[PDB]
């Protein structure tokens, strides 16, 4: 059934929230803040994970060229 | 044993801070500016300034100044004083007038030989010709303005010559001269110039470069007046002889005087006003070429620009001199505002000189380098660019997305065009469905069906590696003769120790112990020579590992030379590598980096300061695409990632910063004038191709947003935008109104988008036009070209463009420069007479005043003239000099310009052209007819010359390596030597001691590598020197030879690793011996005994000049057959006819113009380019982006070798060893990458660096359009004589001859002929059939050459790289 | 089924809302700080919140009003005079034009007193 | 369905890349040195694990 | 019709991807290179991963 539009809408809501978070994290330094390191998402592990996957997909091409060698 | 040879011409810049320091120390106060330079110069002066101040004459002048007797002025005041000097009466007057009369008479007498030869060959036929007799009658009274500029130039050059000679003789010599230029007292070193005028009670202090500039001004004005007088006399005789421009010289002298008054009223700041006059001349041009609205807009903009420049000059002058010693030097006409009267009169004189004539207006561009050069304030230019490069830019994210998407779209489109597919995408899931179809079909949409949404979508595309970085550094691209910046810790070594604090001096003496000898080099060459740990894969590792990021040694040094920026060696390597990778991989995708009415306009923008507006957010959105395409990161983004974290410092010698005590790190020194941080990118020159292709991408984005076509052409610091847009004309709207409206709207849009990406265009940089084609500084209107040819020959003088004052290079430079009065100015006679004026000056007048060879060269030339008088039975030494100055420099004569160069630019055989030139020149004395077959008449002079040319003692030595280096070399000491042959042994002796083991080991094996390279191809019995050149360019010895030849052009080769600007006496003696042998060569080539009294004199009956040239070339090398080099001379082979014969049987050149004159006119025919017939080659299908450029070049060379030498007995072994050694592949693997050549004759079609690609005429391209050529009647004759057999006569040169011949006949007869028929001498044409080569290549010697010079071998095609080739 | 249309309508509403925020988004280039002690990251905020920072001297720019005009997508009078149909002469260039036009010789400046 | 399912799969694959880029922007936009040093240490650990993985899956010989 | 809605959604998502990727690339400026976080924002590429591969297969001799 085409009820995965619910998941698509959930992902879009997540993207909206994180976009607002980005535009406030860029410039909210004075009154949206009393110290540093505002309460936020701070999840660098998914970033490291996408870096892993992309570097591994590049290493796959390198290793295929080496296999052809 | 070390001498210092100073400049005779301004090569560097005039320094504001050097002048300020010297004059501030000498007068004990702020001289030009109240900055740190004056304070540090007065507190701790340099020793060379203390030497000037402590002279007795300087002490007396300072005493007078401190008593109020003399007044201190600015160097421009004294420039105006000098350019007015005419003091002395009747003695210097008679002497100078007699000298100028003599120079002019001798120049006309030397030109008479060539004019007679030309008129005798064209069939138009002390001074023999009537034309030059009338000209000598016209030019026997030099006018007062010419005498004035000649006298001034002579005095200034005498002062300079005296100083240079006594400075070679004595180090530390200060010239003190108050007698040469009467009224002025000069005190001249290389470290300063103090000029004092006594009756005016004025004194100025300036630099040696300023005296050089003054002498250059006087020379430039003498040259303007001389060219204009020659041209006016020629046009009085014949309106077709002189130049197309006609100048009144009293108006020109008034121009000079009024520009001098502008520079005297406004001080150094007056060069702003002087520079803003190019706009006034362009407005006078557009008042003729453009239409009312365009020309009115440009005129108003130009007036605003000039008055803004003058107001800024006044304000800056008043603010600068307020607290200096020049506070009472500003005239009242500055505050009165009455300077506008002077400016008005200057502009009116410019408009009078232009005479409402496109020729005069285009020529008047010499005015801009006729007034000298300004002293540039280095700290002030630093401060001007700081505010632009520190400014925060604000971008819409959609603007950056559209710019990145337009760049990516151009990349995709060019990649599909050149490689037949999209680039490899690593995130192709981001394309919606409409771009997935283009990706899978390997197509792209056009800019019309493209959308801004499409560009935003494409901005999300990432790529895989397409192009590969070279792993071994190309030493040819990374070595030069410029200076290197020291590291950040050693940046205080760029200033004198006196100017630096004591703690800075102690810190430098302690920090030099922590750096290598390469990091303490100050020069690029010795930076690389002193590297005992140099590795060829060092740059590759620095780029892969990003060793340039966050480097503590990074600094940007700025030098007054527009603020030439420097950085240490690592970062300079990275910059050069990024620019080279762009130039050789990406510039192929950006080819412009070289209704009832369709509206059209033109927008011209100045991109000189385009870099300062670029930030990371605008340039690196595209540099990231380039990084991904190369599999690397931050290589093309290196500038905006590293420069923001370094310090920008002005490192001129006399512009030190104030370093606060206890501060010793440059990044801790206080920001000040000439010293700032946080430079948000945009260094000029660096990353220029990146910003060019980004400008092209933005132009595509603008064309998409404005819905008009764009034809951009970005040539350096200037882009031209041809805009087209199909509109529908409104009620009663004219085409001009529509074009102007299009220009206005397109200007609005261009401004809006450039401001979107952070560049604020200014109305002074950009102007709109409609039809006028002004690109590459050339005026071109209605198809006709309008040259500025007087501007190219302003600096023609004795010792120009030469090293150690080489006589031969000076003559060659004079000829090459003066040839532009004929190539562009379309005047053979004006070019000839001007060249002979300055060649006679060089030979007869300045050769006895050599700074290193005091008069030995003149005694040698007198020996040569006596020998010529004895040989050719001449009347005196004057006739002998006239003959010497017309003999080719190949035989040892003094004529840099052969006669063929007046009719076609290129030739495939210099020896035949030299022999033909000599025959034509000696016809002036032997009275031979150049329209007849060669004959023995009574005079054996030409017979004696030709006998001496063909008869000599054979003495070949290293013939094959020499024919590799120069396929047209002669051997047996039959030609003049060049500095690269004389200096190369010294270069290798110096390089053998270099700490760098690459250069050391390549120089230690240099002699044996030459011996082996001579043995490789020595048993191939038919000698093909162009095939030898192809063999030589495929071996690693060619790169070593290029490095050595670059080093050998330096002054003082032996002092390269000595850290000195002095010249060693051994280099002086080597250059002196070389000059003397080159001068006296004509004695050894033409022996008085004719070298044969046993073999009788040569008989010129049925003599082929080309057979004689082939014999000379073969005998000089003691070879039997030399193929593919000798070719007929079309000037000699072709007989010129003006009436139709019985049957044509020649090349027929007809004038399609209807007028009797074609100069300054355009015809219906297509321009003639030359463009020799090209090869037929089948390119193999493989992935060429997998290979670097050097690997593909090596593959092309090896394919050419397999083509030319396919018939040698050793071809398999030869090609196998070449492929293994240079490419790393076997021959069977490398052969699949070779282009297969379908052309049978490689003697015709082989493409080498030693062969001309084009054969143009000695005539502007616009002029070739007036004539039509027909080579049909000569084809039947050539095929009935040589049926289906190849011959050595060049076709393109045969048409070039006819076109230039039409032009020259119009020049000399005042009427263009209706047709010209070129009938060939068939005994001068021979077969050129590709031979069957016999013999074996020395394979042992080949592999020993490869193994000795292995440090210069290119990258080898890997297995990983070879598997990717055919996927 | 009237549900798939509601789902797609909400999805397209959120997509338009995301693209609006993306197209009203201004990037301020990285550069020196106020105290000239270092570099600050590239700032990305909304167009109005950035025009306010240009207005309130929060981001030091050379030309405040012209940047604020370009961000507001309005044409300031400086670029309305740089790309204007007519180029007006300055008073200095007016006087220079009056001097140049007409061979009236009313210049009357003697260069020998220089 | 073929078209519907394939288009929904592509839409999900685009939403995942959007969320990844937003993770990158949010993590790098946090401007204390803490997150910067965390990214740097995670990048030294990523290189180490990549080296070890290439080694272990190259030990198949 | 639903396929047209999904294709318009895909077009809008591609535009969002382009915008956000330009933002990612432009945000990896001088301060990210100074802090050593730029290869995490821009990604690892062919030369660096080849360097990793060599380091991984010549540790001692294997």
UniProtKB/Swiss-Prot annotation, chain A:
**Localization of this protein:** Virion; Host cytoplasm
Q: Does the keyword RNA-binding apply?
A: no
Q: What is the effect of changing residue 42 to S?
A: Almost complete loss of interaction with the nucleoprotein
**Which residue windows are coiled coil?**
none
Reply yes or no: does the keyword Phosphoprotein apply. Answer: yes
Region annotation (Oligomerization and binding to RNA-directed RNA polymerase L) maps to 1-30
Primary localisation category? virion
Q: Which keywords describe this protein according to UniProt?
A: Host cytoplasm, Host-virus interaction, Inhibition of host NF-kappa-B by virus, Phosphoprotein, Viral RNA replication, Virion
Which BP terms from GO are recorded? symbiont-mediated suppression of host NF-kappaB cascade; viral life cycle
Maturation and modification: Constitutively phosphorylated by host.
Q: Name one GO molecular function term.
A: RNA-directed RNA polymerase activity
**A single cellular component GO annotation:** host cell cytoplasm
Tell me the domain comment. The N-terminus is important for viral particle assembly. The oligomerization region is central. The C-terminus part contains binding regions for the RNA-directed RNA polymerase L and the nucleoprotein.
> How does this chain assemble?
Homotetramer. Interacts with protein M2-1; the interaction between the two tetramers is required for the anti-termination and elongation transcriptional activities of protein M2-1. Interacts with host phosphatase PP1; this interaction recruits PP1 to the inclusion bodies. Formation of a complex PP1/M2-1/P allows P to target host PP1 phosphatase to the M2-1 substrate. Interacts (via C-terminus) with the nucleoprotein N (via N-terminus); the phosphorylated phosphoprotein P binds to N-RNA complex. Interacts (via N-terminus) with the monomeric RNA-free nucleoprotein N.
The entry's family comment says: Belongs to the pneumoviridae phosphoprotein P family.
| Descriptive protein name | Phosphoprotein
Which species?
Human respiratory syncytial virus A (strain A2)
Chain's gene name: P
Swiss-Prot record, chain B:
One GO CC term, this protein: virion component
The cofactor(s) it depends on are: Mg(2+)
Q: Name one GO molecular function term.
A: ATP binding
Upon changing residue 1180 to A, the result is: No effect on RNA synthesis
Catalyzed reactions:
RNA(n) + a ribonucleoside 5'-triphosphate = RNA(n+1) + diphosphate; GTP + H2O = GDP + phosphate + H(+); a 5'-end triphospho-adenylyl-adenylyl-cytidylyl-adenosine in mRNA + GDP + H(+) = a 5'-end (5'-triphosphoguanosine)-adenylyl-adenylyl-cytidylyl-adenosine in mRNA + diphosphate; a 5'-end (5'-triphosphoguanosine)-adenylyl-adenylyl-cytidylyl-adenosine in mRNA + 2 S-adenosyl-L-methionine = a 5'-end (N(7)-methyl 5'-triphosphoguanosine)-(2'-O-methyladenylyl)-adenylyl-cytidylyl-adenosine in mRNA + 2 S-adenosyl-L-homocysteine + H(+)
Which compartment or compartments is the protein found in?
A: Virion; Host cytoplasm
Keywords attached to this Swiss-Prot or TrEMBL record, sorted alphabetically, are:
ATP-binding, Host cytoplasm, Hydrolase, Magnesium, Metal-binding, Methyltransferase, mRNA capping, mRNA processing, Multifunctional enzyme, Nucleotide-binding, Nucleotidyltransferase, RNA-directed RNA polymerase, S-adenosyl-L-methionine, Transferase, Viral RNA replication, Virion
Identify the residues that bind Mg(2+): 606, 717
Name the consequence of residue 717 to A: Complete loss of RNA synthesis
**What is the cofactor note?**
For RNA-directed RNA polymerase activity. Mn(2+) can stimulate de novo initiation but it is inefficient at supporting elongation of de novo initiated RNA.
Segments of this protein annotated with the region GDP polyribonucleotidyltransferase:
874-1366
The outcome of changing residue 718 to A is:
Complete loss of RNA synthesis
List its EC numbers. 2.7.7.48, 3.6.1.-, 2.7.7.88, 2.1.1.375
Using the record for this protein, list the coiled-coil segments as residue ranges, or answer none.
Answer: none
The subunit field of the Swiss-Prot or TrEMBL record says: Interacts with the phosphoprotein (via C-terminus); the association of P and L forms the polymerase complex.
The domain comment in this protein's record states: Contains an RNA-dependent RNA polymerase (RdRp) domain, a polyribonucleotidyl transferase (PRNTase or capping) domain and a methyltransferase (MTase) domain.
This one is known as RNA-directed RNA polymerase L
Its source organism is Human respiratory syncytial virus A (strain A2)
Taxonomy of the source species: Viruses, Riboviria, Orthornavirae, Negarnaviricota, Haploviricotina
Swiss-Prot record, chain E:
User: What GO MF annotations does this protein's record show?
Assistant: RNA-directed RNA polymerase activity
Tell me the compartments it is located in. Answer: Virion; Host cytoplasm
How this chain assembles, per its entry, is: Homotetramer. Interacts with protein M2-1; the interaction between the two tetramers is required for the anti-termination and elongation transcriptional activities of protein M2-1. Interacts with host phosphatase PP1; this interaction recruits PP1 to the inclusion bodies. Formation of a complex PP1/M2-1/P allows P to target host PP1 phosphatase to the M2-1 substrate. Interacts (via C-terminus) with the nucleoprotein N (via N-terminus); the phosphorylated phosphoprotein P binds to N-RNA complex. Interacts (via N-terminus) with the monomeric RNA-free nucleoprotein N.
User: What is the species of this protein?
Assistant: Human respiratory syncytial virus A (strain A2)
Predominant localisation class: virion
Q: Which gene encodes it?
A: P
Its family remark reads:
Belongs to the pneumoviridae phosphoprotein P family.
Residues annotated as signal peptide: none
Q: What is known of its domains?
A: The N-terminus is important for viral particle assembly. The oligomerization region is central. The C-terminus part contains binding regions for the RNA-directed RNA polymerase L and the nucleoprotein.
Explain the purpose of this protein: Plays critical roles in regulating RNA replication and transcription through its interactions with multiple proteins. Tethers the RNA-directed RNA polymerase L to the nucleoprotein-RNA complex. Recruits the M2-1 protein, a processivity factor that is required for efficient transcription of viral RNA. Acts as a chaperone for neo-synthesized nucleoprotein by forming an N-P complex that preserves N in a monomeric and RNA-free state and prevents the association of nascent N with host cell RNAs. Recruits the host phosphatase PP1 to inclusion bodies to regulate viral transcription.
Query: What are the start and end residues of every segment in region (Oligomerization and binding to RNA-directed RNA polymerase L)?
Result: 1-31
Outcome reported for the amino acid change (mutating residue 43 to S) = Almost complete loss of interaction with the nucleoprotein
The superkingdom listed in its UniProt entry is Viruses
Q: Which GO terms describe its biological process?
A: symbiont-mediated suppression of host NF-kappaB cascade; viral life cycle
């Amino acid at each position: 059934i085409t009820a995965r539009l619910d998941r698509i809408d959930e992902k879009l809501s997540e993207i909206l929230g994180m976009l607002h978070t980005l535009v406030v994290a860029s410039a909210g330094p004075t009154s949206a803040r009393d110290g540093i390191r505002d309460a936020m998402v701070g999840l660098r592990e998914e970033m490291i994970e996408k870096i892993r996957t992309e570097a591994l997909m590049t290493n796959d091409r390198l290793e295929a060229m080496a296999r052809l060698r | 044993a070390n001498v210092y040879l100073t400049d005779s011409y301004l090569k560097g810049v005039i320094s504001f801070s050097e002048c300020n320091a010297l004059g501030s120390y000498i007068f004990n106060g702020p001289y030009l500016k109240n900055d740190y330079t004056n304070l540090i110069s007065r507190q701790n002066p340099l020793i060379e300034h203390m030497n000037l101040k402590k002279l007795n004459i300087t002490q007396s002048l300072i005493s007078k100044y401190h008593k109020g007797e003399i007044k201190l002025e600015e160097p421009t005041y004294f420039q105006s004083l000098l350019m007015t000097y005419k003091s002395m009466t009747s003695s210097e007057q008679i002497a100078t007038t007699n000298l100028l009369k003599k120079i002019i008479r001798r120049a006309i007498e030397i030109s008479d030989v060539k004019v007679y030869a030309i008129l005798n060959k064209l069939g138009l036929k002390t001074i023999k010709t009537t034309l030059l007799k009338k000209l000598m009658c016209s030019m026997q009274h030099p006018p007062s303005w010419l005498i004035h500029w000649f006298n001034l130039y002579t005095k200034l050059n005498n002062i300079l010559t005296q100083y240079r000679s006594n400075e070679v003789k004595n180090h530390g010599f200060t010239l003190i001269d108050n007698q040469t230029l009467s009224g002025f007292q000069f005190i001249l070193n290389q470290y300063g110039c103090i000029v004092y005028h006594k009756e005016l009670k004025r004194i100025t202090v300036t630099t040696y470069n300023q005296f050089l500039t003054w002498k250059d001004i006087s020379l430039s004005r003498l040259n303007v007046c001389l060219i204009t007088w020659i041209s006016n006399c020629l046009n009085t005789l014949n309106k077709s002889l002189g130049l197309r421009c006609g100048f009144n010289n009293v108006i020109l002298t008034q121009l000079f005087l009024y520009g001098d008054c502008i520079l005297k009223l406004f001080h150094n700041e007056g060069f702003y006003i002087i520079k803003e006059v190019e706009g006034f001349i362009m407005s006078l041009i557009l008042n003729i070429t453009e239409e009312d609205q365009f020309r009115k807009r440009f005129y108003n903009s130009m007036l605003n620009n000039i008055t803004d420049a003058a107001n800024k000059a006044q304000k800056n002058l008043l603010s600068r001199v307020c607290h200096t010693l020049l506070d009472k030097t500003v005239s009242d006409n500055i505050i009165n505002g009455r300077w506008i009267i002077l400016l008005s009169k200057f502009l009116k004189l410019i408009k009078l000189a232009g005479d409402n004539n496109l020729n005069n207006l285009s020529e008047l561009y010499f005015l801009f380098r006729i007034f000298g050069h300004p002293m540039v304030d280095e700290r002030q230019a630093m401060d001007a660019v700081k505010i632009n490069c520190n400014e925060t830019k604000f971008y819409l994210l959609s603007s950056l997305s559209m710019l990145r998407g337009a760049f990516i779209y151009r990349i995709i489109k060019g990649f599909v065009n050149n490689y037949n597919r999209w680039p490899t995408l690593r995130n192709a899931i981001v394309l919606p469905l409409r771009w997935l179809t283009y990706y899978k079909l390997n197509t792209y949409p056009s800019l019309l069906e493209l959308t801004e949404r499409d560009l935003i979508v494409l901005s999300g595309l990432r790529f895989y590696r397409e192009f590969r970085l070279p792993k071994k550094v190309d030493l040819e691209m990374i070595i030069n003769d410029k200076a290197i910046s020291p590291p950040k810790n050693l940046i205080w070594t760029s200033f004198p120790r006196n100017y630096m604090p004591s703690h800075i001096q102690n810190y430098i003496e302690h920090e030099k112990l922590k750096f290598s000898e390469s990091d303490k080099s100050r020069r690029v060459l010795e930076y690389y020579l002193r590297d005992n740990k140099f590795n060829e894969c060092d740059l590759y590792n620095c780029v892969v590992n990003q060793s340039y990021l966050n480097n503590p040694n990074h600094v940007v040094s700025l030098t007054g030379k527009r603020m030439f920026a420097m950085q240490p060696g690592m970062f300079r390597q990275v910059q050069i590598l990024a620019e080279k990778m762009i130039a050789e991989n990406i510039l192929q995708f950006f080819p412009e980096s070289l209704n009832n009415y369709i509206s059209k306009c033109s927008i011209i923008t100045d991109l000189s300061k385009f870099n300062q507006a670029f930030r990371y957010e605008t340039s690196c959105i595209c540099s990231d695409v380039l990084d991904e395409l190369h599999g690397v990161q931050s290589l093309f983004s290196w500038l905006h990632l590293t420069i923001p974290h370094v310090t920008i410092i002005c490192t001129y010698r006399h512009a030190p910063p104030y370093i606060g005590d206890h501060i010793v790190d440059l990044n801790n020194v206080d920001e000040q004038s000439g010293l700032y941080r946080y430079h948000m990118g945009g260094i000029e020159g660096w990353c220029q191709k990146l910003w060019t292709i980004e400008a092209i991408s933005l132009l595509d984005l603008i064309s998409l947003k404005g819905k008009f076509s764009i034809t951009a052409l970005i040539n350096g610091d200037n882009q031209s935008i041809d805009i087209s847009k199909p509109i529908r004309l409104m009620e009663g709207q004219t085409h001009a109104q529509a074009d102007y409206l299009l220009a206005l709207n397109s200007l609005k849009l261009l401004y809006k988008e450039y401001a979107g990406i952070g560049h604020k265009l200014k109305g002074t940089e950009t102007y709109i036009s409609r039809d006028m084609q002004f690109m590459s500084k050339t005026i071109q209107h209605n198809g006709v070209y309008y040259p500025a040819s007087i501007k190219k020959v302003l600096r023609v003088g004795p010792w120009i463009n030469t090293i150690l004052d080489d006589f031969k290079v000076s003559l060659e430079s004079i000829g090459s420069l003066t040839q532009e009065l004929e190539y562009r100015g379309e005047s053979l006679l004006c070019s000839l007479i001007f060249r002979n004026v300055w060649l006679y000056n060089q030979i007869a007048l300045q050769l006895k005043n050599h700074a290193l060879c005091n008069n030995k060269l003149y005694l040698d030339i007198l020996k040569v003239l006596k020998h010529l008088k004895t040989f050719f039975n001449l009347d005196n030494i004057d006739t002998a000099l006239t003959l010497y100055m017309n003999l080719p420099m190949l035989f040892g004569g003094g004529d840099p310009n052969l006669l063929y160069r007046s009719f076609y630019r290129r030739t495939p055989d210099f020896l035949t052209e030299a022999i033909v030139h000599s025959v034509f020149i000696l016809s002036y004395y032997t009275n031979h007819d150049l329209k007849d077959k060669l004959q023995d008449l009574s005079d054996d002079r030409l017979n004696k010359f030709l006998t001496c040319i063909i008869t000599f003692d054979k003495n070949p030595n290293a013939e094959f390596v020499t024919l590799m280096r120069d396929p047209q070399a002669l051997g047996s000491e039959r030609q003049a030597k060049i500095t690269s042959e004389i200096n190369r042994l010294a270069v290798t002796e110096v390089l053998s001691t270099a700490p760098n083991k690459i250069f050391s080991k390549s120089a230690q094996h240099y002699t044996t590598t030459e011996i082996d390279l001579n043995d490789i191809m020595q048993n191939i019995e038919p000698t093909y020197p162009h095939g030898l050149r192809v063999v030589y360019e495929s071996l690693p010895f060619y790169k070593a030879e290029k490095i050595v030849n670059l080093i050998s052009g330096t002054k003082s080769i032996t002092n390269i690793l000595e850290k000195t600007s002095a010249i060693d006496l051994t280099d002086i003696d080597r250059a002196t011996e070389m000059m003397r042998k080159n001068i006296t060569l004509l004695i050894r080539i033409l022996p008085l005994d004719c070298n044969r009294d046993k073999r009788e004199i040569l008989s010129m009956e049925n003599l082929s000049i080309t057979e004689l040239s082939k014999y000379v070339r073969e005998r000089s090398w003691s070879l039997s057959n030399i193929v593919g080099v000798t070719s007929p001379s079309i000037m000699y082979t072709m007989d010129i006819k003006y009436t139709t014969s019985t049957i044509s049987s020649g090349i027929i050149i007809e004038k399609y113009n209807v007028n009797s004159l074609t100069r300054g006119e355009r015809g219906p025919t297509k321009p003639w380019v030359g463009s020799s017939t090209q090869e037929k080659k089948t390119m193999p299908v493989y992935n060429r982006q997998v290979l670097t450029k050097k690997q593909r070049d090596q593959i092309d060379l090896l394919a050419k070798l397999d083509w030319v030498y396919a018939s040698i007995d050793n071809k398999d072994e030869f090609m196998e060893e070449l492929s293994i050694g240079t490419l790393g592949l076997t021959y069977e693997k490398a052969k699949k990458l070779f282009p297969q050549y379908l052309s049978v004759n490689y003697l015709h079609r082989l493409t080498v660096s030693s062969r001309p690609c084009e054969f143009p005429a000695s005539i502007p391209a616009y002029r070739t359009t007036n004539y039509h050529f027909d080579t049909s009647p000569i084809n039947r004759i050539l095929t009935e004589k040589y049926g289906d057999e190849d011959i050595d006569i060049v076709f393109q040169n045969c048409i070039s001859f006819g076109l230039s011949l039409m032009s020259v006949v119009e020049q000399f007869t005042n009427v263009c002929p209706n047709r010209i028929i070129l009938i060939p001498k068939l005994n001068e044409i021979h077969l050129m059939k590709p031979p069957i080569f016999t013999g074996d290549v020395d394979i042992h010697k080949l592999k020993q050459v490869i193994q000795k010079q292995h440090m210069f071998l290119p990258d080898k095609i890997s297995l990983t790289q070879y598997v990717e080739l055919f996927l």
